């Protein structure tokens, strides 16, 4: 029993995180096979089409790349893919795990391996927000830190960290160099669309509260609302649409509470929470997924 | 910018977690040197003076120990130390890190390496509560999972998991085999004292919020009280309102000096908000977060 936001174990990712420095710019890279992925702004703060000419003018021998073992790697080639710089090394990483490059959807949760100087210093979970940001914890030098999980012995890579927007919001690319949310790696003003609370994860958290209380809650409404009616309301109140899933179906069956009862709870509690807490909180938790809640049963 | 509850990287610990089986009891062990630490109730569900005779009654060849690699270890000796069973292996773990066995105090936070069948499946942070429990996430087979952090290239081990009390409360021993909170590894009703909100961690969280408002609105937070309260006076109030006592620390001193805000203004804020929070949130919440430590907040400034 008990519900936590789980982090994936890090040993397989630690074996792939290297330091990448160029003319005093210090960040991190992901070494898979004979390929290092890192943010292109390790070269400097350029914009638009200046990048392709900065690339051809760069010097491979000036990429300072060290491993956690202290071994210096030698860059033999370079190219850009989106906002990710791709550096080929002379020798392959023999500790490359099985992996996939996957784009994270809204509400998807994964683990950040927060790195400085090529060394993972700590981990934490995050959720891909509706506006292409994550709520993370990053300082200077963290770029190149990666977001991942592990599923059936495969490392899924979702994210590489590039920049911090106002109000402690963070964003970056997938491992194919496409920026989440359409942001750009320029220190300029960028519009951030409003964050919509992730209904499906809130539903997971409400079910976790019900399972916890099994030992029905007073905050749980008794009336119902259809999925269409909730989704109409959601688009007007800052929530994502409710979408059916296998995990949510299992949670409803295990607890014996129809999910449309939880949707009505969301509408009423968002309008006026009142004095009754849900798992000690007077605000919705939306970074715990239905799959994780079910795995903890 | 941004504040998260951090987990320590797990590679050093993953290389030390093994599966330990005895007569259908399948748990986890911590393999350091030629020594495996695991919960004694891998031997079955006994009580009191029964354990020593059960230890003499067990035989080493019936312990099935396997590493994450699939390698079978051979137990050459056994002893009890408190509620921890200590098994000697024929060969030593060549991947043993530098480590310390340390007893976590109330409010100390660390990483749980949650393991099943000798394999770490996930991590998460926990805080040692005032009653000797942690609020974790554990299923059958999770015992022998360890709580740890890494400091200065040294793995501190604080905790090994033994049991789950009512209301999703988890507890266990330090690596010296002493149970936190005076619990025992028996399936009977047990006395569980109140869980008090950890003041020192709330203070840290409030500093984190001051820092965030400073770096988002260049001003002091709207909810921060103007008056101060004495530490002795706050600690008198804390004893009658379900909070731990405040106690100064180097990390809290640094946070006070970086932000320029007297910590006694934060203690008065706790008293005011606990009696009547109101409508202004703190870092998006209307309830105290007490599992983010001063040390962690300091490390997340730089
Ligand atoms: C990568 N090492 C670094 C990580 C930032 C630094 C503080 N917290 C983080 O997450 N990324 C940067 O410094 C980028 C680099 C540019 C070229 C994209 N710059 C920023 O993140 C910038 N924010 S912005 C895009 O101007 O709004 C800062 C440095 C002012 C935060
Ligand atoms: C160890 N693998 C297991 C971990 C528990 C199981 C479910 N969640 C956990 O944290 N520990 C046990 O099964 C112990 C064993 C005894 C001999 C110490 N038993 C319990 O935790 C028991 N709770 S109790 C001590 O009666 O209050 C359960 C199994 C009923 C939860």
């Amino acid at each position: 029993s008990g519900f936590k936001k789980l982090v994936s174990p890090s040993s397989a990712v630690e074996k792939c995180i290297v330091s990448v420095s160029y003319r005093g710019n210090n960040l991190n890279g992901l070494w898979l096979g004979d390929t290092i992925y890192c943010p292109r702004h390790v070269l400097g703060k350029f914009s638009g089409d200046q990048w392709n000419d900065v690339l051809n003018l760069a010097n491979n021998h000036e990429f300072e790349v060290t491993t956690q073992h202290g071994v210096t790697l030698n860059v033999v080639s370079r190219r850009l893919k989106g906002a990710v710089l791709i550096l080929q090394t002379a020798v392959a990483n023999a500790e490359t795990p099985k992996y996939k490059f996957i784009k994270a959807n809204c509400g998807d949760s994964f683990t950040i391996a927060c790195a400085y100087g090529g060394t993972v210093v700590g981990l934490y979970p995050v959720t891909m927000r509706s506006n292409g940001t994550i709520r993370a914890s990053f300082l200077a030098g963290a770029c190149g830190s990666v977001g991942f999980n592990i599923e059936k012995g495969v490392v899924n890579f979702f994210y590489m960290h590039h920049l911090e927007l106002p109000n402690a919001l963070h964003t970056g690319t997938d491992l194919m160099g496409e920026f989440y949310g359409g942001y750009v790696d320029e220190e300029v003003a960028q519009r951030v669309p409003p964050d919509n609370l992730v209904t499906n994860n809130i539903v997971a958290w409400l079910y976790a509260a019900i399972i916890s209380v099994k030992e029905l809650p007073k905050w749980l409404e008794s009336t119902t609302v259809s999925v269409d009616d909730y989704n109409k309301w959601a688009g007007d109140n800052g929530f994502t649409p409710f979408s059916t899933s296998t995990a949510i179906t299992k949670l409803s069956a295990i607890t014996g509470v129809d999910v449309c009862k939880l949707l009505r709870t969301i509408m009423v509690k968002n309008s006026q929470w009142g004095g009754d807490p849900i798992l000690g909180q007077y605000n919705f938790e939306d970074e715990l997924t239905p799959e994780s809640v079910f795995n903890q049963i």
Side-chain angles (χ1 to χ4, degrees), chain A residues 14-48 50-55 57-76:
Chain A
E14 295 177 52
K15 295 171 189 171
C16 298
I17 290 272
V18 297
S19 96
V20 178
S21 294
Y22 194 84
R23 301 193 177 178
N25 294 318
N26 305 302
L27 329 170
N28 308 276
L30 181 69
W31 188 31
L32 311 163
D34 69 326
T35 315
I36 297 173
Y37 305 82
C38 68
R40 70 184 171 182
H41 73 254
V42 69
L43 292 166
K45 296 172 196 173
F46 304 92
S47 61
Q50 320 182 318
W51 286 113
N52 183 83
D53 301 273
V54 163
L55 197 274
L57 196 33
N59 169 25
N60 298 335
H61 314 293
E62 258 179 279
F63 287 107
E64 305 168 49
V65 178
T66 70
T67 73
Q68 198 207 189
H69 281 200
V71 174
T72 289
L73 314 182
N74 294 296
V75 177
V76 300

Side-chain angles (χ1 to χ4, degrees), chain A residues 42-48 50-55 57-134 136-151 153-164:
Chain A
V42 69
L43 292 166
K45 296 172 196 173
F46 304 92
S47 61
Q50 320 182 318
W51 286 113
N52 183 83
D53 301 273
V54 163
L55 197 274
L57 196 33
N59 169 25
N60 298 335
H61 314 293
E62 258 179 279
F63 287 107
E64 305 168 49
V65 178
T66 70
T67 73
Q68 198 207 189
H69 281 200
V71 174
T72 289
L73 314 182
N74 294 296
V75 177
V76 300
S77 96
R78 56 191 193 279
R79 74 182 184 269
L80 291 173
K81 176 189 254 250
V84 169
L85 173 63
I86 288 176
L87 307 168
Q88 187 170 36
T89 56
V91 47
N93 181 1
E95 281 174 314
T96 302
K98 281 189 256 149
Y99 70 89
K100 288 190 199 253
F101 290 172
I102 287 175
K103 205 166 136 113
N105 300 317
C106 173
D108 278 8
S109 305
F110 51 87
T111 295
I112 289 294
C114 185
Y116 302 91
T119 286
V120 179
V121 301
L123 315 148
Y124 46 85
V126 297
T127 292
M128 179 55 51
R129 311 301 300 182
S130 72
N131 60 5
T133 65
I134 59 170
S137 173
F138 287 127
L139 300 171
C143 287
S145 289
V146 294
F148 74 99
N149 71 15
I150 300 170
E151 281 176 356
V154 179
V155 182
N156 293 322
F157 288 110
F158 300 103
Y159 178 89
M160 172 175 287
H161 182 57
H162 286 251
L163 57 106
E164 181 188 277

Side-chain angles (χ1 to χ4, degrees), chain A residues 133-134 136-151 153-190 192-212 214 216-217 219-222 224-257 259-295:
Chain A
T133 65
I134 59 170
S137 173
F138 287 127
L139 300 171
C143 287
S145 289
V146 294
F148 74 99
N149 71 15
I150 300 170
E151 281 176 356
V154 179
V155 182
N156 293 322
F157 288 110
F158 300 103
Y159 178 89
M160 172 175 287
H161 182 57
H162 286 251
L163 57 106
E164 181 188 277
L165 299 167
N167 299 314
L169 293 179
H170 302 98
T171 190
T173 60
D174 61 2
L175 266 292
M176 299 180 204
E178 173 164 44
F179 254 98
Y180 286 98
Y183 305 107
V184 295
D185 59 336
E186 302 158 27
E187 297 185 344
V188 300
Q190 298 185 59
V192 177
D195 203 341
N196 295 320
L197 294 178
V198 186
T199 292
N200 277 17
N201 291 352
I202 294 172
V203 160
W205 178 67
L206 288 173
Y207 276 126
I210 292 164
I211 293 154
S212 300
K214 268 180 261 173
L216 282 185
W219 47 259
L220 176 74
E221 288 286 309
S222 284
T224 165
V225 56
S226 69
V227 170
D228 278 28
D229 276 350
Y230 175 85
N231 280 359
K232 281 139 206 183
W233 172 93
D236 269 330
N237 280 274
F239 288 78
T240 66
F242 173 78
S243 187
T244 187
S245 81
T246 56
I248 291 171
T249 298
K250 294 190 200 156
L251 292 172
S252 192
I254 282 153
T255 50
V257 181
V259 60
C260 291
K261 201 81 83 195
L262 274 60
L263 297 174
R264 172 57 92 230
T265 300
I266 292 173
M267 298 160 80
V268 170
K269 283 276 183 197
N270 187 58
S271 295
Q272 207 195 66
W273 197 285
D276 302 16
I278 298 165
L279 284 173
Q281 303 207 330
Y282 306 89
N283 69 286
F284 293 118
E285 164 74 51
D286 69 350
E287 295 203 341
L288 180 64
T289 62
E291 288 88 355
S292 180
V293 167
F294 179 75
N295 290 340

